[PDB]
């Protein structure tokens, strides 16, 4: 056994990042040992979610009957170092022919971040190799002429920014600080935010790109010298924790924090001591979607480079109760690909014409016209490869460490964002 590899009639590549490491100078052209770096529990959960999805589909006698799905999965803690695993999915017999017009895999799920996706997508786009991202929210990926085989199952930053503006307009504060991760995710958020508020009462009073030795003492020094009460923190788990943890440390108080869905469901910060001190945390969040059978799969599961977890001794409970965000996206990504395969093969409800030549670009054509139900949602993508499913909600971190829903974002309504203000208890 390896969790990272499962034989089958057809292979899906799985691009994940189970560990985190900061960028560092290197002098040799070789893969990084990711397995000795800092473990990320909610990422591992998303990893398992894909393994659960493939096993469920292989258990099924109506979706892809008698045609098994396998996978090659990777843990890419570093974008610049992920190319060996990329070459494996794209290779024909462990060889890449640059000028080629049957790759190892028929599609790939992931990656999770805009940065990973920008570094590798071109190699996939050249032959219309389907990438279905479960987390990459960069605006640029809606440009179909640049990324014509790139689909995703989460929404663009545009939407999330709209939702975040919706929250601000619903209340009375109009000076805003905007702290963003010093990367493509963050930077793209800042431009979507600036665009959306140009024609409004909202004024961007302060912004800073957030990185490793951001002097948080001095960021918070100006923020309170400009008397800003509202602070948007648009960043990944690692950067967000830095910001919030520094805030408690520097005793920043009486602020309204606004989170994107990357950390509105953080399970560390709400239980953190002193959290109460910094004011009130609201955010845009993905509603918890219940994926049935996943709990049982986890209990049963806890028992080439970048294909090692190095994570025995895991509390099954701590994985189950980890940040469930992006779960349905991963789930749907795998199913989107399985349905495309199913339809390319021209399967029936109990049989599949056997041993057929499938080409990744045929999967793309079936992927794009995806239209099927899954847990009573409808899985479809628009002309940009963006998803026409998934809600956002507004949460409030309440006195007992829970992210209580207090509102909804409606993509196509007159009042775009609605909030039961009485549920919010203000610190």
């Amino acid at each position: 056994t390896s969790e990272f590899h499962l034989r089958g009639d057809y292979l899906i590549g799985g691009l994940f990042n189970i560990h985190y490491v900061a960028a560092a100078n290197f002098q040799r052209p070789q893969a990084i040992d990711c397995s000795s770096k800092l473990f990320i529990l909610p990422n591992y959960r998303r990893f398992q979610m894909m393994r659960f999805s493939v096993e469920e589909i292989n258990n099924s006698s109506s979706l892809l009957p008698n045609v098994s799905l396998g996978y090659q999965m990777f843990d890419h803690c570093s974008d610049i170092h992920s190319f060996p695993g990329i070459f494996k999915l794209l290779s024909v017999n462990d060889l890449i022919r640059p000028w080629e017009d049957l790759p190892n895999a028929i599609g790939v799920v992931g990656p999770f971040t805009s940065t990973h996706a920008l570094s590798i997508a071109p190699i996939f786009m050249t032959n219309l190799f389907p990438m279905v991202s479960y987390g990459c929210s960069g605006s640029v990926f809606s440009k179909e002429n640049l990324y014509p085989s790139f689909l995703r199952t989460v929404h663009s930053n545009k939407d999330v920014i709209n939702a975040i503006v919706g929250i601000i307009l619903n209340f009375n504060w109009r000076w805003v600080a905007f702290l963003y991760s010093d990367d493509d995710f963050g930077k793209d958020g800042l431009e979507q935010f600036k665009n959306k508020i140009e024609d409004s009462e909202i004024c961007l009073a302060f912004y800073k790109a957030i990185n490793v030795n951001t002097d948080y003492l001095q960021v918070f020094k100006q923020i309170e010298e400009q008397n800003i009460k509202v602070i948007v923190v648009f960043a990944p788990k690692v950067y967000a924790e830095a910001v919030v943890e520094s805030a408690v440390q520097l005793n920043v108080t009486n602020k309204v924090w606004i989170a994107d869905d990357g950390w509105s469901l953080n399970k560390k910060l709400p239980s953190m001591n002193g959290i109460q001190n910094i004011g009130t945390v609201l955010g845009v969040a993905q509603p918890v979607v219940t994926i049935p059978g996943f709990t049982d799969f986890i209990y049963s599961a806890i028992s080439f480079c970048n294909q090692k977890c190095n994570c025995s001794n895991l509390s099954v409970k701590s994985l189950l109760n980890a940040d469930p965000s992006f779960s349905f996206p991963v789930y749907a990504a795998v199913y989107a690909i399985a349905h495309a395969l199913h339809n390319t093969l021209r399967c029936g409800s109990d049989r599949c014409p056997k041993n057929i030549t499938v080409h990744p670009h045929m999967i793309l054509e079936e992927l794009k016209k995806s239209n099927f139900t899954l847990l009573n949602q409808t899985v479809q993508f628009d002309e940009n490869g963006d998803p026409k499913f998934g809600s956002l909600s507004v949460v409030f971190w309440n006195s007992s460490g829970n992210a209580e829903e207090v509102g909804s974002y409606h993509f196509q309504s007159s009042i775009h964002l609605s909030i039961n203000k009485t549920k919010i208890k203000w610190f």
Partner: antibody
Amino acid sequence: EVQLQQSGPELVKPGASMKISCKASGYSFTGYSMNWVKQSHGKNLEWIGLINPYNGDTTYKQKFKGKATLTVDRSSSTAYMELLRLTSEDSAVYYCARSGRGAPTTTTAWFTYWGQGTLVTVSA
Amino acid sequence: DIVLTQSPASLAVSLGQRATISCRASESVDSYGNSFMHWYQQKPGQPPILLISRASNLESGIPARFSGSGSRTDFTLTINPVEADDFATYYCQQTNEDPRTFGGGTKLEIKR
């Protein structure tokens, strides 16, 4: 150009009610508070209240609670003030005015754009 | 409710000379490092025009002969030099606190 175009002068009977419109153009309607201001002939300016066109939230000066009702219609970019149970004390020029950009709050915002005004005459 | 008292009530200033209008507020109108006092010009039969916001910021489109200053509770609008189309009522306005309130106005007349 930002323009606020108010509805024409009205003559209305005592005890009746009346509705004034403010058509906004040339900016994004839901991003700025719409304020309403009264001016009796004596020419004191009085703030009636404001509405957040994004969600319909309203704030009123206490003496106009249940006198004035502010609403918006987002699809036509139009703000309305309904005046209830009219008396001769309600004969005045009424203005709609848009919050500008730069105030820390919706409360502190000043008025950069005004409609031309609506003269209301309350008489039998 | 913050009460605004302008002085003088009315004023006559010769062309090319300086006009000084005052506003005193019952309570301070300071917050967020600013003074939320603004000045408007209203010619007869027309909506008020914003001249100066937050006590001293000249709005775009307004000549530099209009200016304002002061803080806390005491504010001055200054017009120098007065030109012929400057007769109007000038209203100060505070927005520090709900409800917003206007001063009673100061009536500026051209002396000739």
